[PDB]
């Protein structure tokens with residue numbers, strides 16, 4: 195499967211570092227370090243991936259979450275990345291993400307940012 | 318914290334069932350059953366939540382992922398929900414979500430659906 | 441078509457007011473007044489809709505944009521709503537939206553909010 | 564303002580062509596031709612932009628809509644792009660977009676795709 199291809203250290207276009215282990219069962223576990231935002235050092239992440247993807251040249255669907263609290267900082271927010279892994283010489287994880295931060299109900303309409311990150315195996 | 322308030326069974330507006338356990342460390346673990354889509358029975362989920370949220374009336378940021386493969390069905394896709402938990406008599410988890418399915422690179426522009434789910438403690 | 445059904449005044453769940461005219465050619469023109477945010481009084485809007493939708497019970501795709509500058513206020517931002525009109529006794533426009541605000545390149549990863557608005561013919 | 568900088572022909576990463584005129588009043592009008600999807604030849608577009616942006620190095624917020632019906636084809640859908648214009652030697656329009664297609668109410672949870680397009684002045 196893509197277990198071997200996904201497991202390892204990845205980098206996105208902002209300079210962030212995504213260290214992950216793909217389990218045989220479809221589990222993703224690791225750490226995330228963001229180069230931007232209210233973030234410092236490494237944060238726990240967990241997620242899931244398709245462990246038996248199609249064999250027609252389609253990518254491998256996956257997703258993971260980081261809550262932005264660690265021993266150093268708390269940003270009262272969480273980001274989820276949703277995307278697909280694309281193997282080969284230029285292996286990539288192409289994602290879109292949603293960052294929700296805690297708000298009062300009056301401000302909840304403004305609680306969620308959306309963006310896109312592309313992860314590669316080389317900085 | 319919100320550990321007690323989050324842990325348990327939740328229902329969204331489509332009839333789906335979200336069974337989760339909030340850990341003291343910020344972990345979310347459980348199962349998801351979707352009332353719609355290429356889905357059948359329960360699927361593994363994992364995620365994260367802010368375990369020390371603000372005490373100013375703001376909600377509690379969280380997120381989780383489901384890869385849509387179980388023993389019965391594989392839909393070559395994954396959904397991430399990003400949102401906040403709002404406690405009280407009418408407790409709610411308000412989310413937006415991203416569903417990515419595996420595609421060829423030529424079709425990757427069309428690989429991601431976006432939506433919103435509101436979860437409540439009563440069906 | 442849905443020209444008659446779309447044209448008119450609509451209200452969303454925040455209390456905002458969406459006044460629109462659907463043209464025979466697929467044009468949407470009107471004004472938007474937001475009950476929340478850095479907004480005051482009415483703002484110009486323009487958009488487009490499917491003027492020959494399917495007749496199988498599917499909704500009518502449409503979209504529109506507001507730039508958040510008028511004679512009174514400038515919020516250096518723009519929102520686009522994308523959704524479908526659903527006719528009948530409980531007529532609805534169900535949307536998701538993207539709000540982008542002007543940022544420096546260093547902050548561009550955080551420039552876009554995402555949400556969802558449901559518009560009805562009654563307040 | 565950015566009227567001169569925005570007006571003209573733009574190209575995104577898929578090969579699509581975005582021809583627009585920025586009006587003094589904040590209007591965007593033009594045509595869109597998509598290199599991908601259920602699309603053929605040019606489609607009408609309309610939108611809005613911030614005509615008095617900040618002068619602190621922030622980008623210029625804007626948005627526009629295309630309904631995917633012309634004389635040749637009807638795809639019962641509409642896309643809205645929301646983003647900012649960034650001037651200079653490497654001028655760019657960075658966007659995220661929402662594509663909604665008409666659906667029955669039972670399938671409405673799956674009606675909206677999300678993505679991101681970067682437009683440049685050179686192919």
Ligand SMILES: O=C(CCCC[C@@H]1SC[C@@H]2NC(=O)N[C@@H]21)NCCN(Cc1ccccn1)Cc1ccccn1
Nearest residue numbers: 208210228230231232233262269270271273291295550
């Ligand atoms: O910045 C963060 C956490 C880090 C996000 C990095 C993102 S994840 C997507 C993208 N990909 C990356 O690799 N990095 C970035 N959360 C914002 C929470 N705050 C709102 C907010 C929104 C925009 C800008 C700054 N803040 C609210 C708040 C609560 C308490 C204190 C301060 N602020």
Ligand SMILES: O=C(CCCC[C@@H]1SC[C@@H]2NC(=O)N[C@@H]21)NCCN(Cc1ccccn1)Cc1ccccn1
Nearest residue numbers: 331333351353354355356385392393394396414418673
């Ligand atoms: O349907 C699913 C999995 C279940 C999603 C339920 C969602 S999660 C968000 C929302 N909230 C809920 O509680 N339920 C719904 N994935 C679609 C994957 N397929 C694309 C697709 C897109 C739209 C409609 C149907 N299919 C691709 C494909 C690969 C192989 C076979 C068949 N299809």
Ligand SMILES: O=C(CCCC[C@@H]1SC[C@@H]2NC(=O)N[C@@H]21)NCCN(Cc1ccccn1)Cc1ccccn1
Nearest residue numbers: 304454456474476477478479508515516517519537541
């Ligand atoms: O608030 C607005 C314009 C009004 C948005 C109302 C939305 S549209 C979606 C939803 N539906 C509705 O009917 N109403 C709401 N733009 C924020 C721009 N600012 C960022 C921002 C982000 C979050 C909260 C406040 N500001 C940046 C900025 C530039 C200069 C000065 C001040 N601020």
Ligand SMILES: O=C(CCCC[C@@H]1SC[C@@H]2NC(=O)N[C@@H]21)NCCN(Cc1ccccn1)Cc1ccccn1
Nearest residue numbers: 427577579597599600601602631638639640642660664
């Ligand atoms: O393809 C389109 C219109 C063209 C979209 C091009 C996008 S806009 C964002 C991105 N940026 C670009 O420059 N190009 C692309 N609409 C899909 C509507 N159909 C769903 C759909 C979803 C995914 C793939 C194909 N179809 C439904 C349907 C109704 C009737 C017949 C056939 N299909």
Ligand SMILES: [Cu+2]
Nearest residue numbers: 231232269295
């Ligand atoms: Cu912040």
Ligand SMILES: [Cu+2]
Nearest residue numbers: 354355392418
């Ligand atoms: Cu499917």
Ligand SMILES: [Cu+2]
Nearest residue numbers: 477478515541
């Ligand atoms: Cu603001």
Ligand SMILES: [Cu+2]
Nearest residue numbers: 600601638664
């Ligand atoms: Cu189609």
